[PDB]
């Protein structure tokens, strides 16, 4: 009485389930038996597929990485660096992180700065509406 011993399971639900007929017992137990084999074999399947995908990754991305130097961040915009900028603004829009990575010695600070210092004579507005065309 009270609440079932610890680790026995006797929900209301279940009892009608295994009683409502004579073999409702060794039925509910046999249908679970099969839902097991079903899920087990669909694991065998996703394993075979995951094993193939793993083969296609053999090599990793090893012969594909390129060192990424340093370029100690400066603050003078050389004419080269502005031209990189305005091109990055056309390729990236506002991804000021990428734009600073392209230029190399400018950080998201002056990248945001430049965006409004030169906003006028580098027709930066037009440039950004080009990237928006996407």
């Amino acid at each position: 009485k009270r609440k079932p011993p610890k680790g026995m399971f006797l929900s209301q639900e279940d009892v009608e389930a295994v009683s409502a007929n004579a073999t409702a017992a060794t039925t509910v137990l046999r249908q679970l038996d099969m839902e097991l084999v079903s899920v087990k074999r669909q694991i065998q399947n996703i394993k075979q597929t995951n094993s193939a995908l793993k083969e296609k990754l053999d090599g990793g991305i090893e012969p594909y990485r390129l060192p990424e130097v340093i370029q100690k961040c400066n603050a003078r915009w050389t004419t080269e660096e502005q031209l990189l900028a305005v091109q990055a603004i056309r390729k990236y829009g506002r991804d000021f992180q990428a734009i600073s990575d392209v230029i190399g010695n400018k950080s998201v600070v002056q990248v945001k700065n430049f965006f409004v210092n030169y906003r006028r004579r580098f027709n930066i507005d037009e440039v950004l509406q080009e990237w928006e065309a996407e």
Binding site: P4, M8, E35, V39
Partner: protein
């Protein structure tokens, strides 16, 4: 102190029983002070008798040893003493009388059966001054207390245990009789198929599961009300299946939830692997593209420089992106290496296990002398509240000593089989025949009949005993409703002790479930080299249709495959009880069958009152009274319960024909 005597008499020391309410309506409805006076006089009189039950506790002696303000009210004391003595709470059993028996007797009573319940009534009635004759079909007293005796061999085929002395009226009987009581060492090894002691580690998991499975049925009954099913009533065995099944269902349910979260993870990995192939593919191109853009050597304009620097930024982005995806692929890769190593239990119970569980079930069929498919789920254990305290004892010298003792002094007609019981407003005749020569017939006329016929005899489909008039429906239906079970023994007598003399009992584990009762338990209790083999559950019914020699065969086998084909002599002497076949028993003892309830036990015990002879003459006196193991709700199926029922009917009969 005095409060201990109340406990030893199955009475609350501090309040008045509903029985006492009936005879002392003054007290119970009165000042709480007098109730305490009553209770003390009661408790102290009980103490006095209990402290020396070898001799009669006269009213004189009681008032003598009463002290303080209590021997003040001598009418109250004489009342309490008489109540205790009528109802058999003092001066019961075999005591030395003080005041000797009435010269001239009053009333005549025929008692059917001289089992313990019959004998106990007979002694009480005789000491109240009535004329008592017992009619017994067998050539011996004791009924289902049946001791086998030959040379120095001695072995109970009937009752053999006193189930505790704390509050057991046999406490008093054993002080009165040379009753050699022996504690039972309650450790018991189990031996399997080919003959292998079950590891102690195992024995305890299964036992613990057995007990958990019982509580489960109790919760299944009281909390969920799993008591009717298909209009029939639920048995303990049914409920045990249902509990066991639901545990297997839960085991499967957990395997499903586990592998089902392996597959969720495997499908997560898969989704990841895909992002990662289509980044290796995407990165491959970005390399080619960056390499070609680097072919344009650096005397080069700014769009061409932007395309080298751009493809590079692009290429190391897709490179970080793929590296975080391949750490997420490592966290997933191990979460899955763990689940593959944390698999819930494969089973609820192994085959080796379920057969050890089946022995614990046979142990339960043996105690209740019946298949668990017959026991009422709701009520099978209804007498458990009333268990005695202290160790369980065997009677080393044969339980028969007790009946034989009680029979001294009584008028017992053996080999007299009652055939018809006639009860009328004027009195009764019992008709009996001689069991040796069926034709010799007897007519006994009396004021009252105490029927202590076994429930199995009363149950006999073509009546072995005819009641005239027939018993009313309320009584017959109680008789059809409760169970009368079965339980048999093989007694094995040897020249040499070849078992372990330090163990009292030890088990044999059956191959199958069906045969879990077949010779499942073995007892060494007696001085002589004697071994008892129990046949419980559905085996008992069947083993009775098998010859004696086969039974002892199967027996010596089991023992040989456990002790060595060489340490096991032939038996000098063998007996095999067959209680269901015995026509003065028709079984072993009662059990609360499914559909019954301990209420039927009370119905069994109601006396019958014949109708008027002349029409319109006043409603008579009750004439037919019932005692016996099956007539006592709180102590069925035992000897103390038989004895108690005898004491009960004696007081009730005397209250009727001698007045209270």
């Amino acid at each position: 102190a005095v409060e201990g005597a109340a406990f030893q008499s199955r009475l609350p020391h501090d309040r008045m029983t509903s029985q006492e309410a009936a005879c002392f309506p003054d007290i119970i409805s009165g000042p709480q002070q007098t109730q305490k006076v009553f209770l003390f006089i009661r408790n102290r009189t009980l103490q006095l008798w209990l402290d020396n039950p070898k001799i009669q506790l006269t009213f004189e002696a009681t008032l003598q040893q009463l002290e303080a303000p209590y021997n003040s009210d001598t009418v109250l004391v004489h009342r309490v003493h008489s109540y205790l003595e009528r109802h058999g709470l003092i001066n019961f059993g075999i005591y030395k009388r003080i005041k000797p028996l009435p010269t001239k007797k009053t009333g005549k009573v025929i008692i059917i059966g001289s089992g313990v319940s019959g004998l106990a009534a007979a002694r009480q009635l005789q000491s109240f001054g009535m004329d008592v004759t017992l009619l017994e079909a067998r050539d011996r007293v004791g009924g289902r207390v049946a001791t086998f005796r030959k040379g120095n061999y001695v072995a109970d085929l009937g009752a053999m245990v006193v189930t505790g002395l704390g509050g057991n009226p046999m406490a008093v009987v054993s002080k009165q009789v040379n009753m050699e009581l022996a504690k039972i060492k309650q450790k018991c090894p189990l031996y399997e198929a080919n003959g292998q002691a079950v590891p102690k580690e195992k024995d305890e998991m299964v036992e613990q599961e057995f007990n958990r499975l019982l509580e489960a049925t109790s919760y299944l009954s009281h909390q969920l009300d799993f008591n009717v099913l298909n209009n029939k009533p639920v048995s303990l065995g049914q409920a045990l299946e249902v509990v066991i099944q639901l545990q297997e269902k839960h085991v499967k349910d957990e395997q499903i939830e586990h592998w089902k979260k392996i597959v969720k993870t495997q499908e997560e990995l898969k989704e990841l692997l895909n992002k990662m192939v289509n980044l290796k593919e995407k990165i491959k191109e970005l390399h080619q593209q960056y390499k070609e853009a680097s072919e344009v050597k650096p005397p080069r304009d700014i769009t061409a420089e932007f395309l080298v620097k751009s493809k590079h930024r692009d290429l190391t982005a897709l490179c970080k992106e793929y590296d975080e995806l391949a750490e997420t692929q490592g966290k997933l890769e191990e979460k899955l290496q763990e689940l593959e190593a944390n698999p819930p239990s494969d089973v609820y119970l192994s085959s080796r296990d379920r057969q050890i569980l089946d022995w614990h079930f046979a142990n339960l069929e043996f105690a209740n002398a019946t298949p668990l498919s017959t026991l009422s789920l709701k009520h099978w254990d209804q007498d458990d509240d009333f268990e005695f305290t202290g160790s369980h004892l065997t009677v080393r010298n044969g339980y028969s000593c007790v009946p034989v003792a009680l029979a001294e002094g009584l008028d017992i007609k053996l080999n007299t089989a009652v055939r018809q019981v006639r009860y009328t407003a004027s009195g009764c005749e019992v008709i009996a025949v001689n069991t040796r020569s069926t034709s010799q017939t007897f007519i006994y006329k009396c004021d009252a009949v105490l029927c202590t016929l076994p429930l199995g005899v009363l149950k006999q489909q073509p009546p072995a005993v005819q009641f005239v008039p027939p018993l009313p429906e309320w009584k017959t239906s109680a008789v059809q409703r409760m169970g009368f079970g079965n339980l048999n023994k093989v007694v094995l007598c040897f020249d040499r002790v070849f078992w372990d003399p330090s163990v009292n009992l030890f088990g044999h584990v059956g191959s199958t479930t069906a045969s879990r009762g077949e010779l499942f338990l073995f007892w060494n209790l007696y001085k002589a080299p004697i071994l008892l083999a129990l046949v419980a559950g559905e085996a008992a019914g069947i083993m009775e249709n098998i010859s004696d020699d086969v039974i002892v065969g199967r027996c010596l086998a089991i023992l040989k495959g456990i002790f060595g084909s060489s340490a096991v002599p032939q038996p000098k002497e063998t007996v095999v009880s067959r209680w269901r076949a015995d026509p003065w028993a028709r079984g072993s003892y009662s059990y609360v069958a499914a559909g019954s309830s301990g209420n039927d036990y009370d119905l069994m015990a109601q006396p019958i009152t014949p109708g008027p002879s002349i029409p319109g003459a006043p409603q008579p006196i009750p004439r037919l009274f019932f005692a016996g193991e099956h007539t006592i709700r709180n102590y069925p199926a035992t000897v103390h319960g038989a004895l108690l029922s005898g004491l009960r009917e004696a007081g009730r009969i005397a209250d009727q024909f001698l007045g209270a």
